[PDB]
Design a protein around this ligand. Sequence first.
Ligand SMILES: C[C@H](CC(=O)O)NCC(=O)O
Ligand SMILES: [Cl-]
Ligand SMILES: [Fe+2]
Length: 296
Amino acid sequence: EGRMQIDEQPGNAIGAAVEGFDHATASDADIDALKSTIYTKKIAVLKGQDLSPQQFLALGKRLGRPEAYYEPMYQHPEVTEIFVSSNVPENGKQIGVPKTGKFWHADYQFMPDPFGITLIYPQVIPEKNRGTYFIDMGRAYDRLPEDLKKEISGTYCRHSVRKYFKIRPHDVYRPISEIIEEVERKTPAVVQPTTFTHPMTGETVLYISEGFTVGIEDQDGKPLDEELLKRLFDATGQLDESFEHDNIHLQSFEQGDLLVWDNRSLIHRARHTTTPEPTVSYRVTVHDERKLHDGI
Ligand SMILES: C[C@H](CC(=O)O)NCC(=O)O
Ligand SMILES: [Cl-]
Ligand SMILES: [Fe+2]
Protein backbone atom coordinates (compact mmCIF):
# COMPACT_ATOMS: atom_id res chain seq x y z
CA GLU A 1 0.00 0.00 0.00
CA GLY A 2 0.95 3.67 -0.24
CA ARG A 3 1.24 4.04 -4.02
CA MET A 4 -2.29 4.92 -5.15
CA GLN A 5 -2.62 8.38 -6.73
CA ILE A 6 -5.94 10.13 -7.38
CA ASP A 7 -6.07 12.85 -10.06
CA GLU A 8 -9.39 14.70 -9.74
CA GLN A 9 -10.75 16.70 -12.65
CA PRO A 10 -10.43 20.43 -11.93
CA GLY A 11 -13.15 22.18 -9.98
CA ASN A 12 -16.72 21.04 -10.56
CA ALA A 13 -15.85 18.88 -13.59
CA ILE A 14 -17.00 15.28 -13.21
CA GLY A 15 -14.56 12.44 -12.77
CA ALA A 16 -11.15 11.40 -11.50
CA ALA A 17 -8.38 9.07 -12.64
CA VAL A 18 -6.84 6.66 -10.12
CA GLU A 19 -3.38 5.24 -10.80
CA GLY A 20 -1.48 2.63 -8.82
CA PHE A 21 -4.56 0.99 -7.28
CA ASP A 22 -4.06 -2.65 -6.28
CA HIS A 23 -7.19 -4.01 -4.59
CA ALA A 24 -5.22 -6.81 -2.91
CA THR A 25 -2.81 -4.48 -1.09
CA ALA A 26 -4.60 -1.11 -0.84
CA SER A 27 -4.63 0.30 2.69
CA ASP A 28 -7.75 1.20 4.64
CA ALA A 29 -6.88 4.86 4.01
CA ASP A 30 -6.56 4.11 0.27
CA ILE A 31 -10.10 2.71 0.22
CA ASP A 32 -11.40 5.64 2.27
CA ALA A 33 -9.88 8.11 -0.21
CA LEU A 34 -11.25 6.20 -3.19
CA LYS A 35 -14.74 6.14 -1.67
CA SER A 36 -14.53 9.87 -0.92
CA THR A 37 -13.57 10.43 -4.57
CA ILE A 38 -16.53 8.38 -5.82
CA TYR A 39 -19.02 10.39 -3.77
CA THR A 40 -17.50 13.76 -4.64
CA LYS A 41 -16.22 13.35 -8.22
CA LYS A 42 -19.00 10.81 -9.04
CA ILE A 43 -16.90 8.66 -11.42
CA ALA A 44 -13.52 7.20 -10.44
CA VAL A 45 -11.60 5.60 -13.32
CA LEU A 46 -9.18 2.96 -12.03
CA LYS A 47 -6.29 2.76 -14.50
CA GLY A 48 -4.30 -0.29 -15.55
CA GLN A 49 -6.56 -2.98 -14.08
CA ASP A 50 -5.77 -6.48 -15.40
CA LEU A 51 -8.19 -8.67 -13.48
CA SER A 52 -9.83 -12.03 -13.84
CA PRO A 53 -13.60 -12.14 -13.15
CA GLN A 54 -12.75 -13.50 -9.72
CA GLN A 55 -10.29 -10.66 -9.07
CA PHE A 56 -12.83 -8.09 -10.27
CA LEU A 57 -15.28 -9.37 -7.66
CA ALA A 58 -12.48 -9.19 -5.05
CA LEU A 59 -11.95 -5.53 -5.95
CA GLY A 60 -15.66 -4.82 -5.53
CA LYS A 61 -15.60 -6.51 -2.11
CA ARG A 62 -13.02 -3.91 -1.00
CA LEU A 63 -15.63 -1.20 -1.60
CA GLY A 64 -18.83 -2.81 -0.32
CA ARG A 65 -21.15 -5.81 -0.25
CA PRO A 66 -21.84 -7.18 -3.76
CA GLU A 67 -25.40 -7.97 -4.79
CA ALA A 68 -26.07 -10.27 -7.75
CA TYR A 69 -28.65 -9.27 -10.34
CA TYR A 70 -32.08 -10.73 -9.56
CA GLU A 71 -32.52 -12.20 -13.09
CA PRO A 72 -29.84 -14.88 -13.56
CA MET A 73 -29.63 -14.83 -17.36
CA TYR A 74 -27.44 -11.73 -16.83
CA GLN A 75 -24.98 -13.54 -14.57
CA HIS A 76 -21.43 -14.52 -15.48
CA PRO A 77 -21.11 -18.33 -15.81
CA GLU A 78 -18.43 -18.57 -13.11
CA VAL A 79 -19.22 -15.57 -10.87
CA THR A 80 -22.93 -15.15 -10.00
CA GLU A 81 -22.26 -11.63 -8.68
CA ILE A 82 -21.02 -10.33 -12.07
CA PHE A 83 -23.68 -8.89 -14.41
CA VAL A 84 -22.63 -9.33 -18.05
CA SER A 85 -23.61 -7.01 -20.89
CA SER A 86 -22.38 -8.74 -24.05
CA ASN A 87 -23.09 -9.08 -27.76
CA VAL A 88 -20.05 -11.24 -28.57
CA PRO A 89 -20.93 -14.97 -28.62
CA GLU A 90 -18.56 -17.34 -26.80
CA ASN A 91 -18.41 -20.78 -28.43
CA GLY A 92 -21.53 -19.59 -30.25
CA LYS A 93 -23.34 -19.09 -26.92
CA GLN A 94 -24.88 -15.89 -25.58
CA ILE A 95 -23.14 -14.84 -22.35
CA GLY A 96 -25.09 -12.35 -20.30
CA VAL A 97 -27.57 -10.16 -22.18
CA PRO A 98 -27.02 -8.04 -25.32
CA LYS A 99 -27.54 -4.29 -25.65
CA THR A 100 -28.41 -3.60 -22.02
CA GLY A 101 -29.11 -0.14 -20.66
CA LYS A 102 -30.26 1.64 -23.85
CA PHE A 103 -32.30 4.07 -21.73
CA TRP A 104 -31.59 6.57 -18.95
CA HIS A 105 -31.55 4.84 -15.57
CA ALA A 106 -29.98 4.45 -12.20
CA ASP A 107 -29.15 0.83 -11.44
CA TYR A 108 -31.77 -1.03 -9.35
CA GLN A 109 -33.90 2.14 -9.22
CA PHE A 110 -36.94 -0.18 -9.62
CA MET A 111 -35.96 -2.13 -6.48
CA PRO A 112 -36.80 -1.23 -2.86
CA ASP A 113 -33.16 -1.24 -1.62
CA PRO A 114 -30.77 -0.01 -4.34
CA PHE A 115 -27.01 -0.28 -3.89
CA GLY A 116 -24.93 2.88 -3.76
CA ILE A 117 -21.94 1.97 -5.99
CA THR A 118 -21.70 0.54 -9.51
CA LEU A 119 -18.45 -0.87 -10.93
CA ILE A 120 -18.00 -1.47 -14.67
CA TYR A 121 -15.00 -3.36 -16.08
CA PRO A 122 -15.09 -3.10 -19.91
CA GLN A 123 -13.84 -6.28 -21.61
CA VAL A 124 -14.43 -5.49 -25.30
CA ILE A 125 -14.35 -1.77 -26.11
CA PRO A 126 -15.54 -0.29 -29.44
CA GLU A 127 -12.82 1.56 -31.30
CA LYS A 128 -15.16 4.41 -32.28
CA ASN A 129 -18.52 4.23 -30.48
CA ARG A 130 -17.16 3.68 -26.97
CA GLY A 131 -18.18 5.13 -23.63
CA THR A 132 -21.22 5.56 -21.41
CA TYR A 133 -23.37 8.67 -21.00
CA PHE A 134 -24.01 10.13 -17.53
CA ILE A 135 -26.09 12.86 -15.91
CA ASP A 136 -25.39 14.00 -12.34
CA MET A 137 -28.91 14.34 -10.96
CA GLY A 138 -27.77 16.35 -7.95
CA ARG A 139 -26.25 18.95 -10.23
CA ALA A 140 -29.31 18.57 -12.47
CA TYR A 141 -31.56 19.27 -9.49
CA ASP A 142 -29.56 22.42 -8.68
CA ARG A 143 -29.94 23.70 -12.26
CA LEU A 144 -33.73 23.31 -12.36
CA PRO A 145 -35.78 26.52 -12.38
CA GLU A 146 -36.72 27.50 -8.84
CA ASP A 147 -40.42 26.99 -9.52
CA LEU A 148 -39.77 23.46 -10.80
CA LYS A 149 -37.88 22.68 -7.58
CA LYS A 150 -40.96 23.95 -5.77
CA GLU A 151 -43.35 21.85 -7.84
CA ILE A 152 -41.58 18.58 -6.92
CA SER A 153 -41.06 19.55 -3.27
CA GLY A 154 -42.87 16.99 -1.13
CA THR A 155 -43.71 14.68 -4.05
CA TYR A 156 -42.97 10.96 -4.46
CA CYS A 157 -42.11 8.95 -7.57
CA ARG A 158 -43.01 5.42 -8.62
CA HIS A 159 -40.32 3.32 -10.31
CA SER A 160 -40.80 0.07 -12.22
CA VAL A 161 -38.87 -2.21 -14.56
CA ARG A 162 -42.07 -2.88 -16.51
CA LYS A 163 -40.94 -1.10 -19.70
CA TYR A 164 -37.45 -2.54 -20.02
CA PHE A 165 -37.75 -6.03 -18.53
CA LYS A 166 -36.00 -8.23 -21.09
CA ILE A 167 -37.65 -11.39 -22.43
CA ARG A 168 -35.89 -14.51 -21.17
CA PRO A 169 -35.23 -17.77 -23.05
CA HIS A 170 -37.86 -19.57 -20.96
CA ASP A 171 -40.52 -16.93 -21.76
CA VAL A 172 -40.92 -18.24 -25.33
CA TYR A 173 -44.50 -19.37 -26.15
CA ARG A 174 -45.90 -17.67 -23.00
CA PRO A 175 -48.72 -15.15 -23.45
CA ILE A 176 -47.41 -11.66 -22.91
CA SER A 177 -50.08 -10.78 -20.30
CA GLU A 178 -48.74 -13.61 -18.10
CA ILE A 179 -45.23 -12.13 -18.22
CA ILE A 180 -46.55 -8.61 -17.57
CA GLU A 181 -48.41 -9.87 -14.49
CA GLU A 182 -45.37 -11.84 -13.30
CA VAL A 183 -43.20 -8.70 -13.46
CA GLU A 184 -45.72 -6.77 -11.35
CA ARG A 185 -45.64 -9.57 -8.75
CA LYS A 186 -41.90 -10.25 -8.77
CA THR A 187 -40.78 -6.60 -8.90
CA PRO A 188 -43.73 -4.42 -7.88
CA ALA A 189 -43.36 -0.71 -8.49
CA VAL A 190 -41.51 1.03 -5.66
CA VAL A 191 -42.27 4.47 -4.21
CA GLN A 192 -39.43 6.82 -3.31
CA PRO A 193 -39.29 10.51 -2.42
CA THR A 194 -38.78 12.41 -5.67
CA THR A 195 -35.73 14.08 -4.10
CA PHE A 196 -33.58 12.76 -1.28
CA THR A 197 -30.49 13.87 0.63
CA HIS A 198 -27.27 12.07 -0.34
CA PRO A 199 -26.05 10.39 2.89
CA MET A 200 -22.39 10.97 2.03
CA THR A 201 -22.41 14.50 0.59
CA GLY A 202 -25.64 16.14 1.75
CA GLU A 203 -26.60 17.03 -1.84
CA THR A 204 -30.24 17.03 -2.88
CA VAL A 205 -30.61 14.37 -5.61
CA LEU A 206 -33.48 14.33 -8.12
CA TYR A 207 -34.00 10.54 -8.19
CA ILE A 208 -35.85 9.96 -11.48
CA SER A 209 -35.00 8.43 -14.82
CA GLU A 210 -36.80 8.14 -18.13
CA GLY A 211 -36.23 4.38 -18.13
CA PHE A 212 -37.68 3.41 -14.76
CA THR A 213 -39.74 6.33 -13.37
CA VAL A 214 -43.35 5.67 -14.35
CA GLY A 215 -45.35 8.00 -12.12
CA ILE A 216 -45.25 10.97 -9.78
CA GLU A 217 -47.58 11.53 -6.81
CA ASP A 218 -48.27 14.47 -4.54
CA GLN A 219 -47.44 14.75 -0.84
CA ASP A 220 -50.66 12.84 -0.04
CA GLY A 221 -50.04 9.94 -2.43
CA LYS A 222 -52.47 11.13 -5.12
CA PRO A 223 -51.14 10.55 -8.67
CA LEU A 224 -50.06 13.70 -10.51
CA ASP A 225 -50.28 14.23 -14.26
CA GLU A 226 -47.23 12.62 -15.85
CA GLU A 227 -46.57 15.78 -17.84
CA LEU A 228 -44.63 16.84 -14.72
CA LEU A 229 -42.29 13.88 -15.26
CA LYS A 230 -41.96 14.80 -18.93
CA ARG A 231 -41.02 18.36 -17.98
CA LEU A 232 -38.44 17.07 -15.48
CA PHE A 233 -37.02 14.63 -18.05
CA ASP A 234 -36.84 17.53 -20.52
CA ALA A 235 -35.20 20.00 -18.13
CA THR A 236 -32.56 17.53 -16.97
CA GLY A 237 -31.48 16.48 -20.46
CA GLN A 238 -33.04 13.00 -20.61
CA LEU A 239 -35.14 13.63 -23.75
CA ASP A 240 -32.26 14.87 -25.94
CA GLU A 241 -31.53 12.06 -28.41
CA SER A 242 -28.62 14.13 -29.76
CA PHE A 243 -26.88 13.89 -26.34
CA GLU A 244 -25.75 17.52 -26.61
CA HIS A 245 -27.57 18.85 -23.50
CA ASP A 246 -25.30 20.66 -21.05
CA ASN A 247 -26.03 18.12 -18.28
CA ILE A 248 -24.79 15.13 -20.32
CA HIS A 249 -21.28 13.76 -19.79
CA LEU A 250 -19.80 11.14 -22.14
CA GLN A 251 -17.40 8.97 -20.13
CA SER A 252 -14.91 7.22 -22.37
CA PHE A 253 -12.32 4.62 -21.37
CA GLU A 254 -9.43 2.52 -22.66
CA GLN A 255 -8.37 -1.08 -22.09
CA GLY A 256 -7.61 -1.66 -18.41
CA ASP A 257 -9.89 1.13 -17.20
CA LEU A 258 -12.45 0.21 -14.55
CA LEU A 259 -15.25 2.67 -13.80
CA VAL A 260 -16.58 3.05 -10.26
CA TRP A 261 -19.43 5.48 -9.85
CA ASP A 262 -22.02 7.00 -7.52
CA ASN A 263 -25.29 5.14 -8.19
CA ARG A 264 -27.18 7.57 -5.92
CA SER A 265 -26.27 10.75 -7.82
CA LEU A 266 -25.87 9.51 -11.40
CA ILE A 267 -28.13 8.20 -14.10
CA HIS A 268 -26.51 6.65 -17.15
CA ARG A 269 -27.28 5.29 -20.61
CA ALA A 270 -25.55 3.29 -23.33
CA ARG A 271 -24.79 5.02 -26.62
CA HIS A 272 -26.91 4.65 -29.74
CA THR A 273 -25.95 1.68 -31.91
CA THR A 274 -24.54 3.93 -34.61
CA THR A 275 -21.81 1.37 -35.44
CA PRO A 276 -21.77 -2.45 -35.45
CA GLU A 277 -18.89 -2.48 -32.97
CA PRO A 278 -19.49 -4.91 -30.09
CA THR A 279 -19.46 -4.19 -26.38
CA VAL A 280 -18.72 -6.58 -23.54
CA SER A 281 -18.64 -5.31 -19.98
CA TYR A 282 -18.63 -6.95 -16.56
CA ARG A 283 -20.52 -5.26 -13.73
CA VAL A 284 -20.31 -5.58 -9.95
CA THR A 285 -22.76 -3.62 -7.80
CA VAL A 286 -22.09 -3.09 -4.09
CA HIS A 287 -23.87 -1.75 -1.03
CA ASP A 288 -21.76 0.67 0.99
CA GLU A 289 -22.17 1.70 4.64
CA ARG A 290 -25.45 3.60 4.16
CA LYS A 291 -28.74 2.85 2.48
CA LEU A 292 -29.49 4.71 -0.74
CA HIS A 293 -31.17 7.40 1.37
CA ASP A 294 -32.14 7.55 5.01
CA GLY A 295 -35.80 6.79 4.33
CA ILE A 296 -35.09 3.26 3.08
C1 LIG B 1 -33.29 -3.54 -16.94
C2 LIG B 1 -31.82 -3.31 -16.64
C3 LIG B 1 -31.00 -4.37 -17.38
C4 LIG B 1 -31.10 -4.31 -18.89
O1 LIG B 1 -30.85 -3.13 -19.39
O2 LIG B 1 -31.36 -5.28 -19.58
N1 LIG B 1 -31.56 -3.38 -15.18
C5 LIG B 1 -30.19 -2.96 -14.77
C6 LIG B 1 -30.11 -2.48 -13.34
O3 LIG B 1 -31.18 -1.87 -12.92
O4 LIG B 1 -29.13 -2.64 -12.65
CL1 LIG C 1 -24.60 8.03 -29.19
FE1 LIG D 1 -26.99 0.40 -15.76
